[PDB]
From a paper:
We purified Arabidopsis thaliana OSCA1.2 expressed in HEK293F cells and determined cryo-EM reconstructions in lipidic nanodiscs and Lauryl Maltose Neopentyl Glycol (LMNG) detergent micelle with cholesteryl hemisuccinate (CHS) at 3.1 and 3.5 Å resolution, respectively. Structures of OSCA1.2 in nanodisc and LMNG were nearly identical (RMSD = 0.81 Å). A comparison of nanodisc-embedded and LMNG-solubilized structures hints at the positional flexibility of the subunits relative to each other while in the closed state. We refer to the nanodisc structure throughout unless otherwise noted because of superior resolution and map quality. The ICD contributes the sole dimeric interface in OSCA1.2, with a buried surface area of 1,331 Å2, only 4% of the total surface area of the dimer. Within the membrane, inter-subunit contacts are nonexistent. Instead, a cleft with minimum width of approximately 8 Å separates one subunit’s TMD from the other. To visualize the dimensions of the putative ion permeation pathway, we used the HOLE program. Towards the extracellular side, this putative pore has an opening greater than 12 Å wide, which narrows into a ‘neck’ approximately 15 Å down the conduction pathway. The neck extends for over 10 Å and reaches a minimum van der Waals radius of 0.5 Å, closing the channel.
Previously reported as putative ion channels sensitive to osmolality, a companion paper characterizes OSCA/TMEM63 family members as a novel family of MA ion channels conserved across eukaryotes. The structure of OSCA1.2 reveals a trapezoid-shaped homodimer with a two-fold symmetry axis perpendicular to the membrane. The bulk of the protein lies within the membrane; the transmembrane (TM) domain (TMD) of each monomer contains eleven TM helices. Topological similarities with mTMEM16A suggest that OSCA1.2 also has two pores and could conduct ions through a structurally analogous pathway lined by TM3-TM7.
Author numbering:
A (entry chain B), B (entry chain A): 3 to 50, 71 to 122, 156 to 401, 420 to 490, 502 to 718
């Protein structure tokens, strides 16, 4: 209804307005400058009208922002821009021809206009990102991953050690390119002990400062809620004792793990003299057995997810299969909160009952990224980049099944107290309009406040911080959040494509979101979010694939929606849409995807040549040998 | 009906019997020994009970036959064996449980038993062939294709020639492995003129010998049927004049093509010092543009299909697309002879009307392999091996659509004068039983006679042969015929899998065919059919894929056939069949296909190492430089 949309918009507009007022005040307080301007502190550049921040955010043209923030950050930001490029002319046309027999054909023709425009834009965007990636990589600084290949599933041998097997194999098969190597160690027990020691120290800092202020009897009952019914009488000496005990265990574990042959995993990081050689090893079959001596480009050391290297290669299939089943149950049992939200989705009081399903769904999905990342870690991936791309994939599917599809179906089930989809989809546009205004418009405006790190920063200063420059530990803005950023905008791309020929009035909400998100994330990318790992936009092929899937879904749903007309006869027309769209995808896959999945030998050779000419005396071996050992071992 | 099957079998059994009597007599006549024992003449080994040939054919165990005949010939023969391994226990079970509620479940369970057995056997066969291939290649003699990579779509340059561009690119990107190269030339005009000259000479040989026997006026009216209404008064001097004219054109063309820069195609055969290097070049991305400087293993020179190298790389997509359309029309318009055959398919006279549809269909399909090969040449492939694999692919599809599916549908259309497929499939088993006995049992028995080369050989001796040792040209048995061999047995694999749980009595006909074909082809492979090119069984992944497709088709058709039972409720069971089957296929694809599609670097290195140790003074450059020039240029 217009009244519910009007009120929901008024609420979300004012909410966003208020968030921007609060933001304007908070960002001018020097005590939280390290929260709002975390980058520039991390980059060594800084030390010590409420919306003016919007036009300032638009300064720093791409080339500068790429060097400042990184390629992934810029490419991610361009997705919001992609959204505006795809849907602005769609929205204009849909309004122009659907908003004041032929209506039937008009819808079919529009499906062709929308698909073609979308494909055209995706093609050009794909080409552009591929070019940005190739230029970025060619101009990128030296890193050990450019010369290093991770070797998995080294076969066992009764006499030779993993190190001996790796060195021998590569000296023989990759002669005069093989430089050095580092064998993977199962240091997980040690790493876990070290993390616990750090947590114990935080308690020591908490209680020592709390005590110093309040010089009385310590009474912590271990958990308080359901802990050990004791007192932790000193609580400081208690944690000192726990630390002393773990410290001894850690020293023992270090001596054992580095002299324990069973800590050696049949894997190693192999380094080559040239990038050309690494490019060859990473792209070629090494032996007869396709599931032995497996090679791939090593993640950069800050991207290597060390825990996953202790998983025997051969059990990875099983872990993956178990997680596929778990994923099914994750989506399966989420129907309960969906049904709840759709039940809720049914004058200033009734319009709130209308409004709230937006929030309720946002809240139920709040911890989904955590679940998806955890299950993604169980499946072994060995890198942060890979883990985030997989979590984003699973989330996208979840949103398709549970946020879009199930909401429409459950909605219809409540409305009803054949092709019922014919009315279920257009009626639910009202729900989606409100939903977008809640996790979209209001969502993004709220995110600029950065309340979580704001609070954490201050609490750490109040209770754990001891001296100067440990403020560096208190300050951590996190990364861009590809895991939630992607899946959210992809839902909107789907909704846009699904409803553009159905309900044109959904699109202005989607467009405002993309515009707002662009300016807010553009702002945050410049000032906060130091990036955890640098992929050279290797996720783009997945972004592309998800939009193509959205096109196919919309094209198919339209067959359903227009499949009620007697003698519709749209079948020989509309079927061409998913066929042509897939053809387009395969074309683009073959033409642009290699930019992202294969490193051409010519680029490797030019890079190696120039690097050598510029730095003729590079001790590459010294540089690479101490990389990829383990964060635990210094 | 039993009477039509009985008579058709009696006809085909006696026909096969007679063919084997005729064969036994013909093979003992010394004047046609070069037809029946063509190999051994080609191998330099020979010079100058009617069924005893069957037990003799079973001598020469695989290892010997592989060296004698070749790997492809042996692997092909094993397909008939694969057939017997898959269907013998299927036939036993189907007879045991279907031939004297639960019938419904019995059929579902059998689908699972058949699929599993088939997949098990295919898995083991796949593994075995992969091992045979790897062993064969490792032990294979030196050939120039082991060191040579074909480079396509060399980009244009205003100043540098294709040769200069290729040499430079490879010296820079593949330094110290690049050995030499040979640029591709558009010698097609010349090659065509040379072939015409040879045809003109054959006429000169025909008329000179005919005249010498009959010393009178020559009266050939150019074609006779619709030629030039003249006499070719001398006919010998006439062809001498045509030869003299083309001879002059050829000399001119040779001088022009080797000094014509426009005859140079942007492609070259690039040779490397090592097999390891060729393996790298052939498996790696060379430049930024994925559709430039494209590399693949060069076909051996006797496999290179030179005509296809004159096609600009960039027009290949268009040629392919045109041929896909042509293929559609080829299958589309074949419905006319299908309908004819099915119309025909409706006491010794009525049983012949029953019998003849077998023959009629065989005859209409007789020239299909020619069509498919011609259209496959239009699409550029550059090798005989590739052309045959593509022709076999298209033929397989044709058989599925036109021989199997359309026959069942057209059959039902005539029978009828909903799920009618429920009865159309089992009723047509009678047709297929007869068809198999005609192009199968009788077909193979007839092929052992080799009537076409028998006749051609004798006619050439009678009219063209002039002296000794030109009998070598008269004798040519052709190759194995993968193009017709594959598609035929695949139809039978399909029919077997489709009808095993439906009509168990189709299977004994299929089994007899596989058994007969095995012994006949085993015999011919040993004695005739010198192989045109040696693939190291690289077609196996396609054989495998076709059987998997047949499993999926049978599994799906069964849903249809059992989908008439009210409350069948077979959907959550039967759907698992194509899902599990595809899963199996992907497993096998990932585990065994690399044996056929990637050459591992370790094997390349071991091969190069051993080769060098055995022959420490190999002038590899001299060896490789004169390869792949063109058959025309000496």
């Amino acid at each position: 209804t217009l009244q519910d949309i009007g009120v929901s918009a008024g609420i979300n507009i004012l909410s966003a307005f208020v968030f921007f007022i609060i933001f304007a005040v908070l960002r001018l307080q020097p005590f939280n400058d390290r929260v709002y301007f975390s980058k520039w502190y991390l980059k060594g550049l800084r030390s010590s009208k409420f919306l003016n921040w919007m036009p300032e955010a638009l300064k720093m043209p791409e080339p500068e922002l790429i060097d400042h923030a990184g390629l992934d950050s810029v490419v991610y930001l361009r997705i919001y821009w992609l959204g505006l490029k795809i849907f602005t002319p769609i929205a204009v046309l849909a309004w122009a021809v659907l908003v004041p027999s032929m209506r039937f054909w008009t819808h079919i023709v529009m499906a062709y206009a929308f698909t073609i425009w979308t494909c055209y834009v995706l093609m050009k965007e794909y080409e552009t990102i591929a070019n940005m990636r190739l230029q970025f990589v060619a101009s990128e600084a030296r890193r050990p991953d450019q010369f290093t290949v991770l070797v998995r599933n080294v076969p066992p041998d009764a006499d030779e050690s993993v190190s001996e097997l790796v060195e021998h194999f590569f000296l023989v098969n990759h002669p005069d390119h093989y430089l050095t190597h580092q064998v993977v160690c199962n240091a997980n027990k040690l790493a876990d002990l070290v993390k616990k020691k750090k947590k114990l120290q935080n308690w020591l800092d908490y209680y020592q400062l709390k005590y110093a202020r309040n010089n009385s009897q310590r009474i912590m009952v271990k958990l308080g809620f359901l802990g050990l019914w004791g007192q932790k009488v000193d609580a400081i000496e208690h944690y000192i004792a726990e630390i002393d005990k773990i410290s001894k265990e850690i020293s023992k574990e270090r001596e054992e793990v580095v002299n324990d042959p069973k800590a050696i995993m049949p894997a190693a990081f192999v380094s080559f003299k040239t990038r050309w050689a690494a490019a060859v090893c990473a792209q070629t079959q090494q032996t007869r057995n396709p599931t032995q001596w497996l090679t791939e480009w090593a993640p950069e050391p800050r991207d290597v997810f060390w825990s996953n290297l202790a998983i025997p290669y051969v059990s990875l299939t099983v872990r993956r299969l178990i997680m596929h089943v778990a994923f099914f149950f994750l989506t399966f049992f989420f129907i309960v909160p969906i049904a709840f939200v759709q039940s809720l989705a049914t004058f200033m009081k009734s319009v709130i009952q209308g409004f709230l399903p937006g929030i309720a769904l946002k809240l139920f999905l709040a911890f989904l990224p955590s679940i998806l990342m955890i299950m993604s870690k169980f499946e072994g991936f060995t890198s942060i980049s890979s883990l985030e791309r997989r979590a984003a994939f699973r989330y996208y599917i979840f949103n398709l099944v549970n946020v879009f599809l199930a909401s429409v179906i459950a909605g219809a089930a409540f409305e009803q107290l054949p092709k019922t989809i014919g009315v279920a989809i257009p009626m639910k546009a009202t729900f989606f309009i409100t939903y977008i205004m809640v996790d979209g418009w209001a969502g993004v405006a709220g995110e600029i406040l950065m309340l979580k790190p704001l609070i954490m920063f201050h609490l750490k200063n109040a209770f754990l911080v001891k001296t100067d420059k440990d403020r560096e530990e208190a300050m951590d803005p996190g990364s861009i959040g590809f895991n939630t950023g992607e899946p959210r905008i992809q839902l909107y791309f789907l909704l846009g494509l699904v409803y553009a020929p159905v309900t044109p009035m959904l699109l202005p909400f989607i467009l405002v979101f993309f515009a707002l998100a662009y300016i807010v994330y553009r702002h945050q990318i410049i000032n906060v979010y130091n990036q955890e790992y640098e992929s050279a936009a290797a996720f783009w092929p997945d972004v592309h694939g998800r939009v193509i899937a959205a096109l196919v879904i919309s094209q198919l749903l339209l067959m359903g929606l227009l499949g009620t007309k007697h003698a519709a006869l749209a079948a020989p027309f509309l079927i061409a849409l998913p066929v042509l769209t897939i053809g387009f995808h395969h074309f683009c896959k073959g033409r642009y995807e290699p930019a992202f999945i294969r490193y051409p030998l010519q680029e490797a050779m030019m890079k190696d040549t120039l690097e050598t000419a510029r730095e003729p005396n590079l001790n590459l071996k010294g540089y690479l040998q101490n990389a990829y050992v383990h964060p635990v071992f210094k």
